Amino acid sequence: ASFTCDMCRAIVDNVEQSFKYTEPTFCPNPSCENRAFWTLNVTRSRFLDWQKVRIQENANEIPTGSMPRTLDVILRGDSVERAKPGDRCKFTGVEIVVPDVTQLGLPGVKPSSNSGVTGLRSLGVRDLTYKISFLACHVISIGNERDQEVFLNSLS
Amino acid sequence: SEPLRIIWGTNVSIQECTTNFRNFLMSFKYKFRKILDEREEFINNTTDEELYYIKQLNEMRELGTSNLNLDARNLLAYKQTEDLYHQLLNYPQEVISIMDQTIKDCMVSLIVDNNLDYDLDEIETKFYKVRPYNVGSCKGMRELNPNDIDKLINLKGLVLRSTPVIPDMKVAFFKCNVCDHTMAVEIDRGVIQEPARCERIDCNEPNSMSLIHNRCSFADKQVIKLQETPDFVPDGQTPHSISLCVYDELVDSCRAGDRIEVTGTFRSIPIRANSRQRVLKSLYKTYVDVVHVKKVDLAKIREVAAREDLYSLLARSIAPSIYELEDVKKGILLQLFGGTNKTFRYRGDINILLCGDPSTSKSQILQYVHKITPRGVYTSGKGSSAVGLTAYITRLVLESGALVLSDGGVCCIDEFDKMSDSTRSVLHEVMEQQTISIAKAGIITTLNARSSILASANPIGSRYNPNLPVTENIDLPPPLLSRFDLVYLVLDKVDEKNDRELAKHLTNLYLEDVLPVEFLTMYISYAKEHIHPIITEAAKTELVRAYVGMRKMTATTRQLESMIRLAEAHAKMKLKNVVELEDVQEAVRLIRSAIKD
Amino acid sequence: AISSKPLSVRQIKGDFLGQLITVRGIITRVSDVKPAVEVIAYTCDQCGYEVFQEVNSRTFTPLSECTSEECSQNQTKGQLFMSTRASKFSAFQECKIQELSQQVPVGHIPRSLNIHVNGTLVRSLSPGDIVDVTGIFLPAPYAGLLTETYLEAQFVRQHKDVEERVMELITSGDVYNRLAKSIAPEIYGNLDVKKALLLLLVGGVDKRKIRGDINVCLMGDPGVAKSQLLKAICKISPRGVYTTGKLTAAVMKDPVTDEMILEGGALVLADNGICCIDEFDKMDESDRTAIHEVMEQQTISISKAGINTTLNARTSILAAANPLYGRYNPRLSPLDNINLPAALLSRFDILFLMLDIPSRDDDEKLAEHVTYVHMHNKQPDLDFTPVEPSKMREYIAYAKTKRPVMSEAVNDYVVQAYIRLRQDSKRFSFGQATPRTLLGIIRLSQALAKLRLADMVDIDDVEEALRLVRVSKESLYQ
DNA sequence: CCCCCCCCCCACCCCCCCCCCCCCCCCCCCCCC
DNA sequence: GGGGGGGGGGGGGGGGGGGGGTTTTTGGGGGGGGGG
Ligand SMILES: [Zn+2]
Ligand SMILES: [Zn+2]
Ligand SMILES: [Zn+2]
């Protein structure tokens, strides 16, 4: 992310992002008085392709026909949209906690309303909770090109 | 002159508690428990002089595993520890932490006192847990009251559902924004003890530490909803339920529908009026914080496999309470064994139907095979008493029907004549392909049912007419009826030479107390585990000539495929690894009996 | 005098707030017991000296900074942490009382009131209790000036030896006849039906399974008014339940709160008891399959919402069913007259077709009986003295536990009687003899043997059980 | 076997918080003993 | 040469201001069952 201050035209840049939309706390200009009044520079900042996909336990792997357990997988960049609804897939990547970003404090959002953890200064009186999600860096499926060249030139 | 470490509110010394537990966790002998319990004369030194918990810790350490089960009555059997039982019941978390630490100290001290070499670093790295159980009477969920609010209790009930695993933070991980220094903070009573200033005195910036969520260390928590068992309810009101919290390797100790016991500390906590405020409601949520959970051979196998009368012996043993229907019993035994699978699909299922008069033993026969089979089901051809035959989409979720639930087991269907037409169509692809095709809500799959069906069907009206064919008596259509390997008729036609002996056999059950009825399931299990028959080359010619014989007499290849599967099942019986000529001959003979109906 | 008077809920005007009043009603629902705080106790980490907060309100705010002078006089901002062990909780329970059907004025909704009960008085109230509760009628702020209001309970008044006292009836004698007549004593005749209905309560003998349950269906006209007979014997049994076909178990979530529960149906309430299925011909297929599983396995299964179970249902089924087109034609089959399927009817141990036949004899007696009830507001004198329900429960329990053994003489006789019956079966109707009817004869004669408190079953018991079966079979034709 | 029916499922005060101002405390520097 | 006093900076506390806080009917499609 990258932000320009409201009361002076100076720019903060390469601002790393937490799970909440993260804005700078101090102005880099030693003259300036600003804290927390900013405009995001959409052109200088960099986004990434992002896609959540929900997966459920394989039908042939459930032990006695009870409910399948589910998980949220995040795909990013070149790996997005390789999944498909009803496809059977193998992913690899990072098992991660994702906080309740509303409870963590968020611009323009009133917080949400299991016992969380509290005392952290950002929360004040609030208590933070976490989902598990899987940040997948790679995907494959495990469950018409009608021109001669585009077919032949893929073969061994 | 020195400080004392006390269990707060009790004046119990933790050194005393520690040593009282140690001198039982080592040097206890199992003989003492029989002194406490009934039948004390069953003490036997050659089995009961064992240092029981030294034995447990040795097997546990060879497995490297963290958990010890502890029947709490064993504390009351031992003189230096009977007081520790009361401290365990009344002040459980402190005593349990002390017991955990003592187990770890016993593991450490054993590899330097018994002094065999071991990875001390492994034990140092590992946590250890005691699991006390059988703490006391299983007092009712409805009987709990606020005196219990910190005691170790015992409950019994039914699991309705459980959450997925919930990550519970055990150590927060903080990083300094300015200087990138990092420090670990243990979570204390659920509260993050945030550092206000950076630890490094050469930096010491205020408010600069930030929490790095995915570098924290998390324990596993799970919440499970336990319903009051209908054994305990008063008749005129709903059952209660209690939420229970369960942690680490005790996660997924049980699943939906399990009847269980739990031993756990009864706990309570306040809950908020609104998340943006500290304000708490004046009456607490209650839950139980569990520490133990519990539900609710080859020599003889080979010896019996040597017998010559084994086919008849096992067949009569499936239902010896039922008067003679012996070819039905033989067919159902062969169905229990089943054929074999192959990769390329052709599979080991065998399928049977019983028709004839309604008021006869066929229902009991279905019940007995249901009791015998490891993972089968009982159902009837239509409707749903919260259990139905077909897979079905409902709220959005796919539910698996009784056929699909009977994967790898016998599916017993009564009222098979009165079955509904959509179900009659659905049976074709499980009969042929052992699957059912699903194509809704973005999910497409052939849901594999892999079940042998034992059907029970009836004539139209009160009586079967044997002067008319099966298709004329029965409701269900011939192409479905054709798929069954063996099809049988059981009839109530009067004959005193049968009826009198049936009645005497039936009535004698009220007076009387070879029939390996309880060994039958073990024989079936080991046969299905170990034996995978292949067809002998001579048995090819036997199958071909038998098939062409019955073809010269309206057969189809389905009959030949059936004879193959029955011969393979006949070879699992007697634990024979290759199908013999006699196996083909009996499969042929029994099918020749069946196809004549 | 005001605490003495039993007000209805709508008579509790706002003027009674703060006063100790007594309210008369029926408890419509009750909460599970929960711990309310009286005094919260806080440990202090940085001085050890605990501090306390008394709570007088629906909500409270937790303390943080240590107010104790051990900290405060040293200006040490130590931290307070709540402790359950040192806190005084009190048992709390919320109930709701509703005014009775006689208290509701014409055309009004029955009004209701929250009851808060604390301390030892907890779980003195059950749903369905009709009760006088004394308490302090009080407000609670949430509306603005409108108040929530409740009754702080103070006192409860409910509106509603055997192993030797049973010998009173044993020595009094003629026990089977008199106890049979005592089922619905005002109901004329049908003493064969009443004699069969008793053998549900005492049951047969179970053995390793062989089953003790006995099942009966009361078919035929609705003008016999069989529902009252089901009501009567339901009240006799110590564990039974009355129901309508208009039964299956289900995961009946969202009962009051949006909340998970499994509903065991009436067939599970009737575990080790009688399920009285009125309007039996009207039931739907889910209930038909439920009845099928309990009548065969004595279980009812679930495969729903991930829950996969079998609930215990060792239950005896008493059923009553009525014909299509209002009135039964005797020349036609029960299968022609009634909606039920034949395979299900075959599983009952006794089948009684109690028709209603007009009669210059019977109708005068029924008319005089009914008109006596209208003219004197009570039933006429019975020409005999009945046994009351709680007193016959002594006998029924004594007969239940005194299970007999079979005898060789009875074995030979039941075989011979059964074969005699199979000769008539060789011919009409579904009422022919089967192995299940032989099991019925055995179970019913065992029930008679239990009723006479014997150690063995008798050919006397067999011939009476056979008479009941034969009478029931003949009832299917008239 | 075909068509029609009918059944099912679905849509204004109080607390937390943040900012601003004032005073006090602690350190450093300079002078005095 | 060390200790006291004066002066300046920095931190903490207190006060003040502000903002937030489910059944019942109607219509439609699809599936299942019954009658000619
Ligand atoms: Zn700026
Ligand atoms: Zn730092
Ligand atoms: Zn303190």
mmCIF file of C-alpha atoms in Angstrom, chain B residues 159-264:
data_model
loop_
_atom_site.group_PDB
_atom_site.id
_atom_site.type_symbol
_atom_site.label_atom_id
_atom_site.label_comp_id
_atom_site.label_asym_id
_atom_site.label_seq_id
_atom_site.Cartn_x
_atom_site.Cartn_y
_atom_site.Cartn_z
ATOM 1 C CA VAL B 159 -23.197 -36.307 21.422
ATOM 2 C CA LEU B 160 -25.325 -34.187 19.072
ATOM 3 C CA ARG B 161 -22.546 -32.364 17.189
ATOM 4 C CA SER B 162 -19.059 -30.893 17.558
ATOM 5 C CA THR B 163 -17.423 -27.783 16.162
ATOM 6 C CA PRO B 164 -14.429 -28.002 13.855
ATOM 7 C CA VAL B 165 -11.165 -27.600 15.742
ATOM 8 C CA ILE B 166 -10.884 -24.074 17.171
ATOM 9 C CA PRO B 167 -7.357 -22.597 17.499
ATOM 10 C CA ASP B 168 -6.721 -21.467 21.085
ATOM 11 C CA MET B 169 -3.704 -19.235 21.634
ATOM 12 C CA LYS B 170 -1.140 -20.536 24.136
ATOM 13 C CA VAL B 171 1.791 -18.165 23.389
ATOM 14 C CA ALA B 172 1.505 -14.766 21.716
ATOM 15 C CA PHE B 173 4.362 -13.748 19.405
ATOM 16 C CA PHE B 174 5.269 -10.041 19.335
ATOM 17 C CA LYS B 175 7.573 -8.147 16.941
ATOM 18 C CA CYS B 176 8.949 -4.614 17.269
ATOM 19 C CA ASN B 177 7.938 -2.336 14.398
ATOM 20 C CA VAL B 178 11.118 -0.234 14.565
ATOM 21 C CA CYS B 179 13.873 -2.758 15.405
ATOM 22 C CA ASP B 180 12.333 -6.144 14.350
ATOM 23 C CA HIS B 181 13.193 -7.754 17.718
ATOM 24 C CA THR B 182 10.817 -10.563 18.727
ATOM 25 C CA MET B 183 9.615 -11.915 22.082
ATOM 26 C CA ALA B 184 7.248 -14.714 23.103
ATOM 27 C CA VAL B 185 4.527 -14.053 25.703
ATOM 28 C CA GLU B 186 2.587 -16.870 27.353
ATOM 29 C CA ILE B 187 -1.173 -16.326 27.477
ATOM 30 C CA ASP B 188 -2.229 -16.060 31.134
ATOM 31 C CA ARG B 189 -5.873 -16.820 32.019
ATOM 32 C CA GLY B 190 -6.801 -16.035 28.405
ATOM 33 C CA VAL B 191 -5.273 -12.519 28.536
ATOM 34 C CA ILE B 192 -2.467 -11.235 26.309
ATOM 35 C CA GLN B 193 0.174 -9.665 28.576
ATOM 36 C CA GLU B 194 1.201 -7.131 25.944
ATOM 37 C CA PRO B 195 4.645 -5.510 26.405
ATOM 38 C CA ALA B 196 4.119 -1.752 26.610
ATOM 39 C CA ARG B 197 7.716 -0.970 25.545
ATOM 40 C CA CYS B 198 10.209 -2.906 23.451
ATOM 41 C CA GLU B 199 12.311 -5.282 25.541
ATOM 42 C CA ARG B 200 15.688 -4.242 24.124
ATOM 43 C CA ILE B 201 17.076 -1.435 26.288
ATOM 44 C CA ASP B 202 19.023 -0.182 23.253
ATOM 45 C CA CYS B 203 15.650 0.376 21.489
ATOM 46 C CA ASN B 204 12.942 0.591 24.231
ATOM 47 C CA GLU B 205 10.375 2.297 21.996
ATOM 48 C CA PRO B 206 6.857 2.555 23.523
ATOM 49 C CA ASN B 207 3.770 1.007 21.900
ATOM 50 C CA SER B 208 5.959 -0.387 19.074
ATOM 51 C CA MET B 209 5.384 -4.120 19.656
ATOM 52 C CA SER B 210 2.800 -5.711 17.345
ATOM 53 C CA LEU B 211 1.232 -9.169 17.360
ATOM 54 C CA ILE B 212 2.303 -11.556 14.571
ATOM 55 C CA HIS B 213 -0.772 -13.805 14.522
ATOM 56 C CA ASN B 214 0.594 -16.649 12.387
ATOM 57 C CA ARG B 215 3.801 -16.916 14.441
ATOM 58 C CA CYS B 216 1.920 -17.408 17.719
ATOM 59 C CA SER B 217 1.606 -20.915 19.170
ATOM 60 C CA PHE B 218 -1.903 -22.383 19.333
ATOM 61 C CA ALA B 219 -3.452 -25.216 21.296
ATOM 62 C CA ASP B 220 -6.478 -27.096 19.938
ATOM 63 C CA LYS B 221 -9.924 -26.505 21.433
ATOM 64 C CA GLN B 222 -13.208 -28.114 20.406
ATOM 65 C CA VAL B 223 -16.751 -27.610 21.729
ATOM 66 C CA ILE B 224 -19.145 -30.579 21.791
ATOM 67 C CA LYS B 225 -22.863 -30.482 22.639
ATOM 68 C CA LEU B 226 -23.954 -33.325 24.939
ATOM 69 C CA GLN B 227 -27.675 -34.094 25.307
ATOM 70 C CA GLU B 228 -29.209 -35.602 28.442
ATOM 71 C CA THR B 229 -29.797 -39.292 27.787
ATOM 72 C CA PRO B 230 -33.517 -40.281 27.640
ATOM 73 C CA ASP B 231 -32.801 -42.855 30.372
ATOM 74 C CA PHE B 232 -32.546 -39.979 32.883
ATOM 75 C CA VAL B 233 -35.221 -37.484 31.722
ATOM 76 C CA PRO B 234 -38.520 -36.961 33.555
ATOM 77 C CA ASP B 235 -41.261 -38.035 31.196
ATOM 78 C CA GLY B 236 -43.052 -34.703 30.660
ATOM 79 C CA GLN B 237 -40.375 -32.296 29.389
ATOM 80 C CA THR B 238 -37.490 -31.769 26.983
ATOM 81 C CA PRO B 239 -34.003 -33.183 27.620
ATOM 82 C CA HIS B 240 -31.359 -30.722 28.762
ATOM 83 C CA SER B 241 -27.916 -30.412 27.185
ATOM 84 C CA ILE B 242 -24.467 -29.224 28.280
ATOM 85 C CA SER B 243 -21.680 -27.802 26.138
ATOM 86 C CA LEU B 244 -18.300 -29.398 26.878
ATOM 87 C CA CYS B 245 -14.841 -28.126 25.954
ATOM 88 C CA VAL B 246 -12.176 -30.650 24.948
ATOM 89 C CA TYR B 247 -8.544 -30.034 24.043
ATOM 90 C CA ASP B 248 -5.497 -31.309 22.134
ATOM 91 C CA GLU B 249 -5.406 -35.103 21.433
ATOM 92 C CA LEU B 250 -8.832 -35.421 23.124
ATOM 93 C CA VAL B 251 -10.268 -33.482 20.156
ATOM 94 C CA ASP B 252 -12.482 -35.760 18.024
ATOM 95 C CA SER B 253 -12.623 -38.433 20.713
ATOM 96 C CA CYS B 254 -16.286 -38.835 19.689
ATOM 97 C CA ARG B 255 -18.619 -38.117 16.772
ATOM 98 C CA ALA B 256 -22.286 -37.245 16.286
ATOM 99 C CA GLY B 257 -24.515 -39.976 17.711
ATOM 100 C CA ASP B 258 -21.955 -41.351 20.178
ATOM 101 C CA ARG B 259 -23.196 -42.127 23.675
ATOM 102 C CA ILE B 260 -20.263 -41.380 25.994
ATOM 103 C CA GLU B 261 -19.035 -40.766 29.487
ATOM 104 C CA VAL B 262 -16.881 -37.750 30.281
ATOM 105 C CA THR B 263 -14.839 -36.919 33.362
ATOM 106 C CA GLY B 264 -14.188 -33.209 33.659
#
